[PDB]
Nucleic acid binder design. Structure first.
Ligand SMILES: *OP(=O)(O)OP(=O)(O)OC[C@H]1O[C@@H](N2CN(C)c3c2[nH]c(N(C)C)nc3=O)[C@H](O)[C@@H]1O
Lengths: 139, 210, 109, 1013
RNA sequence: AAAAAAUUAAGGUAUGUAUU
RNA sequence: AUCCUUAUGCACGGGAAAUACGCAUAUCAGUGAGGAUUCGUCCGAGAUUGUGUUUUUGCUGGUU
RNA sequence: GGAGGUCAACAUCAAGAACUGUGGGCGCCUAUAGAACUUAUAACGAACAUGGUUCUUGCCUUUUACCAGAAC
């Protein structure tokens, strides 16, 4: 967890989305105490190095910055939200909400595919992508 | 992470700057009610915590001079070798379609080779039987051949022999009798061997060529 | 160590005499393509594997070769043929060479 | 946490409770790590304490073998000579048995290729390779480390040992040599048996018949009894200790080999990071391991029987007995042991007592283990399977005999060799009190009742055999069969394995598994499956589980029904081809099929015939029962013998025409007598054992381990099933209606082929690709199986829900169906739907526009088109407007192919046309009803715009290539439009876009000549 | 004058540019 | 002057391989790398460690 | 002072014998808290609904739906 940095103001969130031109900006929105927001914080931290060349990761806490709760509508322990060139990206995991991510993904590998898929599709301006594995059943 | 360092906003809202898109008495009474309910209504740390106090002692020089990155399984080397081993694939050769192998060709073909080396020094049972549709195809072609020449029994014995291998029995034995209808010796020779089984019948067949 | 990028790179071509010879390992040959053809409305030729699971070998035989069940030599592509790695190649020859010495000893003794 | 949680999840998966895809994968790794830790602990402590065999113990063992061999007069096996007759025959055998692993593969793993190349060089340089092998047998005593991997059977996690390939070839050669020479010198006698001649279920038949034949086992008239034992010898291979092993092999072989065999088992075993030398046990991944196991088993079994008895069972070396026989009834009745066999581990012993002998053995045990509380029967194991009436009764007299007899045999075998415990051993008794004699061979549970004591309650069963004494030639016993409670739980786990192992596979790969697993299960246990109630219940449950997996991928929501045609049509017609054990209703509503001829449109329904409904036939017919097969073989083989006598009697050789009558009959099967390679298969021996031990060398589940079809022949034919299932769904015609086959545009299906999706996936993995690319390409063979069956999967009946429209097309979707939204959206690109309409409009203009004269028409004007008319459904407007020189004689609005037409009805003016485009489902592929209804609604609709109230709609099915028109008629229309529409639908460029664009989606093709030009 | 009901719902959002 | 031997360099012609070829402000290494053994002795130069590319490197030609 | 208040606030709420602690009054008595045992859980309510967790039955291996048993 101490690998991955944290964002302590909503102004750290916004500049961080802007200044990274060439890579995804992946953010976990959720709060330290949570059962499920700790688990994801692991599965990302392990992956963050492998992917440094196309994706950048950060951590944010709903309690630290609540400014973003209404606009993106944040419910539940945590939401993974992908950004490329200020454009909110979007993917269908078969789960019935195409915005963000909720459920906890299981393998390191299946997580890297999703990041890679989003980036590759995203690079072409495509706003939707399809997660190869569709965990509607899972979540 | 240069921004991470800096720390100051303008007195600025987060949503607006980026260009963001989104994709009291009753209360008091409620609180009171809730209270009327609160009134009415770890282990790991304990295990360790006791050790953590134990640590306090350690000096700051020692905290520094701590060895930093020791691997004891050589995981990196093994992993790399594994990736290299698993990289590419290859296509399997064409000797491997499963149909061909007969041992008897194989031993005779080999053993001889081995012997030569020494001297110098000095159908498949797996396969599914012919589908009816496909067999029918063969029959048509052979019929066409036969019709093309009413003579030339070379095309007659083929229809008996090709048929015989694929099926035989009722069919071939009737054809070899049909095309037999005098001059060719070959037809007669063919006919007796397939058809005969029994001595009387063999004799009768023989009375044909003779 | 870091995954390169998922960006695609324009496809480059070459093919000589030499580069055809190498690539031949990595393509399904002619004969091997005909196994991917399944001729419709009739059952595949199958031969059971050592294991006994049946291996469908689709159009790899001509419809006159099915009915007589000949099987076809056809054209065999030597190019893919399996061949030894560099490390392994000398360990056989070296073993063989050393072995010949052994035999002679017994020849003379 | 890590260790406990690892055991805790394992039992959860033993159960069949669902623990998720990921956990099951991890758990195997963790269990493998624990097992290797235990192995490393077992060996480190055999350094400290030394070999457990004790010198005094060893002499007793080693002495038995020494007497046996000498008694038997056994010459030791020599070293393979440089000049040896059979070196060729034994290389070819050995290399091909290494080779056949790769005969199923389109592609090779980088290592696999290395091994393959190595065999090639063996054929190419036979002289050179043989010398290499011989010199390594003489000298090499250091070897390269072996690697361990673990199978998961979801129940028993087992080791798999991968050796290095140059060392494989000597080991294979050596193994073949030892088995060929061994059985040529008759080392292993009758009673060690997973032997060559008999298939395991045939062995179970022979054993029960042998039990019957022994004289007067049944009569309990005078206090007689009888007993069986089933004992796993326990750790055997894991306890084999070498300093003894070297000695015993020296006894039966020449040292140079024995030394090699002992050395080959040291090694150094790596699993990832761990490493330990194998000092103590036997590694079972090596080719000759099978031979060593039988030799160690022959040690043990001379302890149990003893020389005195063992020579009775075996017989003299001049005339050794057959499997179960003796010479005289006297020699049978000497000793309590009557029959003995051992199959790998497990032992079977039959004992015949009389009270005189009986009371003794009971009493001695009692004295040395006094039980005043009668606690013998606490820890006694019944066979759970059978009802109370049929099990073992627990009675003091009999419960003591079981524990007495077993306690005798623990005494004979010292605990250093093996570990025989009570728990793993089941014992049965047959006495006055217990009518039933119970045992399990393979995974058969057998009971026998004699006809003598039948009176105790019986109901007949599917598995029943009648057993015949060779003298009375009557039916003195019966045999009921059941499938062991192990082999049922293997199946349940193996089926879960299908649905677990695949996060993404095709639909076709899954239904291909479920064939192989089910087909294995039925063929082995033939009679018994019909007698086992829980097993039958699982088969029905299993089939639906697979189907549900299919359905969920096709759509998230699930359907009320999916027609039985989808799953059960054979691979060629585009179905999963899956077999069925169950009862499935082909609803008679789904048999309806419609065809078009230039005369008209004809329909067929056999639904109105009311008889027994049509059901998808099941396996239970097609495989004959095990009884009939043996009952045939005896007679078949005798017939063959007679025929063999007859030709040489006439000085003639056997003709095929004789035996063309019976090929598929007889368990070896006659065909194998006339196989071409039979000459050199006679040197391959011990094959039945190898196949059982192929488990350990490599990772594939080999559902058929009980046959080599080279030796046995082919044991089942399910051809008859393929045809039957096609017939049940009503012929190829009734099937194809459910497909897009008619929207391909082909007339007939004779010259067509499919491009398989299996090898299609191969061409795509020869490029360098990321994982995410790589998985994206495994879905493509799913996407073809939607289109081809898309017309049935998309209907109101199946997916209920709410309809939606593709944004420029007249196709509706009932569900999301994410893979059929895509394929259709490509199949119409660049507004293909509009273009089709326009082309058809053009055809009718240029048809009529030339014909102003003959039909006496003053103008033909194709109107403006609001661009969106074509595809939208609810309202329509006219296109082509027709006029007259004067007026026209209309008729009663009617349909194209009709005959009777009278024009006197009206006399009115001017006409219009609509060309309407439908892509229909299976529910209504008849445009006749549709067209007319649409016409009526449109003429009397207020919103709809038409020039006159006189017009002709033209409906067209893009899906099935159907057309019709419900017209107002004039002389020279019906005879025109009929001739035009034939050339319209079999020409236009817009259609020929679809029909080519679709037959890409399905990858259907035509061909005449394959060979490249 | 021989007989119709006793099962429900979410996992279904086309990008992309232009205008407001 | 011819002729012959070994090493190295440029080079026509003929083959084989790219799971192969390298690189390091980096560790040791004939002052013995790494192996073989018939147990008496015998061969004698690379082995670790991190890394780059590896179903391909550069370059043309056809056809759409 | 009394009854009644469809008025509220604040405490408790099955009963009993026996142990320990605190407080008051002159070793005894009274009150409160905790633990154990019994009654039958004779019922604070002759009434009885929903939810959470953990287990065991069915399940699309999904729910803001459930089937029908168990304990908390
Ligand atoms: O080839 P050329 O005549 O140019 O040689 P030079 O003129 O460079 O002159 C003197 C060298 O000639 C060589 N010869 C010549 N001859 C005839 C000869 C030589 N060497 C020998 N041996 C030394 C065996 N025998 C001869 O008959 C020598 O290199 C002289 O140095």
């Amino acid at each position: 967890s101490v690998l991955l940095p944290q964002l302590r103001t909503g102004w750290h969130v916004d500049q961080a989305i802007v200044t990274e031109t060439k890579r995804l900006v992946v953010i976990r929105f959720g709060r330290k105490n949570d059962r499920q927001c700790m688990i994801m914080d692991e599965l990302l931290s392990s992956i963050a190095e492998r992917v440094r060349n196309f994706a950048v990761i950060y951590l944010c806490d709903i309690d630290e910055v609540s400014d973003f709760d209404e606009m993106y509508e944040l419910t539940d322990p945590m939401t993974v939200m992908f950004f490329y060139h200020n454009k909110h990206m979007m993917c269908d995991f078969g789960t019935g909400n195409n915005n963000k991510l909720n459920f906890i993904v299981d393998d390191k590998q299946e997580m890297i595919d999703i990041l890679e898929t989003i980036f590759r599709g995203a690079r072409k301006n495509k706003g939707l992508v399809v997660s190869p594995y569709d965990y509607n059943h899972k979540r | 992470p240069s921004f991470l360092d800096q720390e100051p906003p303008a007195g600025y809202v987060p949503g607006i700057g980026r260009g963001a898109t989104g994709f009291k008495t009753l209360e008091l009474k409620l609180a009171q009610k809730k209270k009327k309910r609160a009134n009415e209504k770890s282990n790991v740390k304990r295990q360790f915590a006791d050790l953590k106090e134990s640590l306090a002692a350690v000096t700051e020089s020692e905290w520094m001079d701590i060895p930093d990155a020791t691997d004891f399984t050589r995981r990196n080397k093994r992993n790399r070798i594994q990736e290299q081993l698993n990289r590419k694939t290859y296509a399997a050769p064409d000797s491997l379609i499963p149909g061909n192998v007969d041992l008897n060709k194989l031993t005779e073909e080999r053993e001889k080779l081995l012997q030569s080396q020494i001297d110098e020094n000095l159908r498949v049972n797996s396969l599914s039987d012919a589908t009816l549709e496909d067999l029918q195809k063969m029959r048509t072609i052979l019929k066409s051949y036969r019709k093309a020449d009413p003579t030339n029994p070379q095309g007659w014995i083929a229809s008996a022999r090709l048929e015989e291998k694929a099926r035989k029995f009722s069919v071939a034995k009737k054809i070899i009798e049909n095309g037999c209808q005098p001059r060719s010796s070959d037809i007669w020779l063919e006919n007796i061997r397939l058809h005969e089984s029994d001595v009387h019948y063999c004799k009768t067949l023989v009375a044909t060529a003779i | 160590k870091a995954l390169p990028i998922p960006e695609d790179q324009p496809k480059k071509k070459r093919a000589g005499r030499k580069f055809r010879k190498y690539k031949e390992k990595f393509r399904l040959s002619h004969v091997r393509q005909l196994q991917n053809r399944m001729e419709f409305g009739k059952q595949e030729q199958t031969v059971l594997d050592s294991y006994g699971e049946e291996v469908g070998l689709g159009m790899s035989n001509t419809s006159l070769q099915q009915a007589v069940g000949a099987t076809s030599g056809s054209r065999r592509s030597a190019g893919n043929q399996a061949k030894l790695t560099k490390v392994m190649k000398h360990r056989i020859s070296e073993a063989n060479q050393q072995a010949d010495e052994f035999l002679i000893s017994l020849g003379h003794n | 946490a890590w260790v406990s949680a690892a055991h805790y999840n394992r039992e959860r998966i033993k159960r069949g409770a669902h623990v998720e895809k990921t956990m099951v994968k991890k758990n195997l790794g963790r269990l493998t790590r624990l097992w290797i830790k235990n192995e490393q602990e077992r060996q480190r402590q055999i350094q400290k304490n030394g070999p457990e065999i004790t010198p005094e113990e060893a002499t007793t063992i080693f002495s038995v073998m020494v007497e046996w061999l000498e008694s038997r007069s056994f010459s030791p096996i020599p070293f393979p000579p440089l000049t040896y007759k059979n070196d060729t025959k034994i290389l070819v055998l050995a290399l091909e048995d290494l080779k056949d692993v790769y005969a199923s593969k389109v592609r090779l793993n980088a290592s696999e290729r290395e091994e393959l190349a190595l065999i090639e060089e063996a054929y190419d340089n036979p002289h050179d390779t043989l010398n290499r092998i011989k010199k390594y047998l003489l000298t090499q005593r250091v070897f390269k480390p072996v690697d361990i991997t673990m199978m998961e059977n979801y129940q028993n996690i087992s080791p798999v040992y991968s050796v290095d390939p140059l060392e494989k070839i000597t080991d294979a050669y050596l193994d073949q040599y030892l088995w060929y020479e061994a059985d040529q010198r008759k080392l292993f006698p009758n009673w060690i048996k997973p032997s060559d001649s008999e298939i395991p279920p045939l062995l179970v038949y022979k054993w029960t018949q042998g039990i019957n034949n022994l004289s007067e086992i049944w009569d309990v008239s005078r206090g007689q009894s009888a007993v069986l034992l089933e004992t796993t010898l326990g750790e055997m291979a894991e306890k084999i200790d070498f300093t003894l092993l070297n000695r015993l092999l020296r006894l039966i072989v020449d040292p140079n080999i024995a030394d090699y065999i002992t050395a080959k088992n040291n090694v150094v075993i790596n699993f990832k990071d761990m490493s330990h030398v194998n000092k103590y046990g036997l590694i079972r991944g090596l080719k000759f391991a099978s031979f060593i196991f039988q030799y160690y088993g022959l040690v043990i079994d001379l302890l149990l029987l003893g020389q005195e008895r063992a020579t009775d069972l075996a017989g003299p070396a001049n005339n050794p007995n057959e499997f179960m026989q003796f010479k005289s009834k006297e020699v049978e009745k000497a000793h309590p042991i009557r029959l003995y066999t051992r199959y790998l581990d497990r032992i079977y012993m039959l004992f015949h007592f009389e009270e005189d002998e009986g009371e003794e053995l009971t009493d001695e045990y009692l004295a040395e283990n006094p039980d005043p509380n009668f606690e013998n029967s606490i820890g006694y194991n019944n066979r759970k399977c059978w009802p109370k009436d049929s099990r073992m009764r627990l009675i003091r007299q009999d419960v003591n005999l079981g524990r007495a007899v077993f306690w005798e045999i623990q005494s004979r075998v010292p605990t250093s060799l093996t570990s025989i415990k009570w728990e793993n051993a089941f014992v049965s008794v047959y006495s006055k009190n217990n009518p039933n004699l119970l045992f399990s061979m393979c995974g058969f549970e057998v009971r026998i009742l004699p006809r003598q004591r039948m009176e105790e309650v019986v109901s007949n069963d599917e598995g029943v055999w009648d057993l015949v004494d060779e003298r009375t030639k009557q039916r003195t016993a019966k045999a009921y069969l059941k499938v062991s409670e192990e082999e049922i739980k293997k199946f349940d786990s193996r089926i879960r394995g299908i649905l677990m192992a695949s996060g993404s596979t095709t639909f076709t790969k899954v239904a291909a598994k479920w064939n192989t697993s089910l087909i294995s299960l039925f063929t082995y246990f033939r009679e018994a499956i019909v007698a086992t109630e829980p097993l039958l219940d699982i088969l029905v449950k299993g089939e639906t589980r697979i189907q549900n997996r299919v359905k969920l991928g096709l759509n998230s929501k699930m359907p009320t029904r999916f027609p039985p045609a989808v799953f059960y049509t054979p691979k060629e017609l585009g179905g999963l081809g899956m077999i069925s054990a169950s009862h499935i209703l082909i609803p008679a509503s789904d048999l309806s099929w419609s065809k078009q001829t230039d005369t008209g449109i004809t329909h067929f329904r056999a639904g109105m015939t009311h008889e027994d409904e049509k059901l998808i036939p099941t396996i239970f017919r097609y495989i004959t029962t095990w009884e009939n097969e043996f009952l045939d073989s005896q007679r078949v083989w005798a017939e063959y013998a007679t025929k063999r006598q007859e030709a040489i009697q006439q000085n003639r050789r056997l003709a095929f025409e004789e035996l063309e009558g019976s090929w598929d009959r007889g368990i070896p099967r006659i065909s194998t007598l006339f196989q071409r390679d039979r000459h050199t298969l006679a040197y391959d021996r011990g094959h039945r054992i190898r196949r059982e031990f192929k488990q350990y060398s490599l990772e594939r589940n080999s559902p058929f381990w009980w046959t080599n079809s080279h030796h046995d022949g082919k044991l089942w034919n399910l051809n008859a099933y393929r045809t039957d299932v096609i017939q049940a769904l009503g012929g190829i015609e009734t099937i194809l209606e459910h497909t897009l086959f008619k929207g391909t545009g082909f007339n007939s299906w004779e010259g067509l082929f499919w491009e398989k999706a299996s090898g299609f996936e191969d061409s795509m993995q020869f490029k360098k690709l990321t994982h995410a690319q790589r998985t994206g390409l495994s879905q493509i063979p799913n996407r073809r199986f939607t289109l081809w069956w898309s017309p049935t999967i998309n209907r109101a009946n199946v997916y209920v829900g709410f309809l939606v429209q593709l944004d420029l097309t007249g196709i509706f979707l009932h569900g999301k169906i994410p893979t059929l939204k895509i394929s259709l959206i490509q199949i119409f690109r660049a507004h293909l739907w509009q273009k089709i309409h326009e082309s058809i409009v053009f055809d009718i203009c240029q048809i009529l526009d030339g014909e102003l004269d003959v039909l006496q028409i003053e103008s033909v004007t194709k109107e403006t088109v609001h661009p969106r008319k074509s595809y939208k459904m609810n309202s329509s407007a006219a296109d082509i407007t027709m006029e007259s020189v004067h007026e026209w004689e209309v008729s009663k609005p009617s349909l194209l192919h009709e005959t009777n037409d009278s024009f006197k009805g009206l006399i009115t003016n001017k006409m219009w046309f609509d060309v309407q485009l439908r892509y229909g489902d299976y529910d209504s592929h008849d445009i006749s009803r549709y067209v007319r209804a649409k016409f009526l609604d449109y003429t009397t609709d207020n919103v709809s715009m038409y020039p006159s109230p006189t017009g002709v709609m033209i409906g067209i099915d893009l899906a099935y290539n159907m057309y019709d028109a419900y017209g107002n008629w004039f002389n020279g229309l019906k005879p025109l439009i009929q001739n035009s529409m034939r050339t319209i639908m079999k020409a236009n460029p817009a259609l020929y876009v679809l029909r080519e664009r679709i037959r890409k989606g399905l990858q259907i093709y035509q061909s005449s000549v394959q060979e490249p030009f």
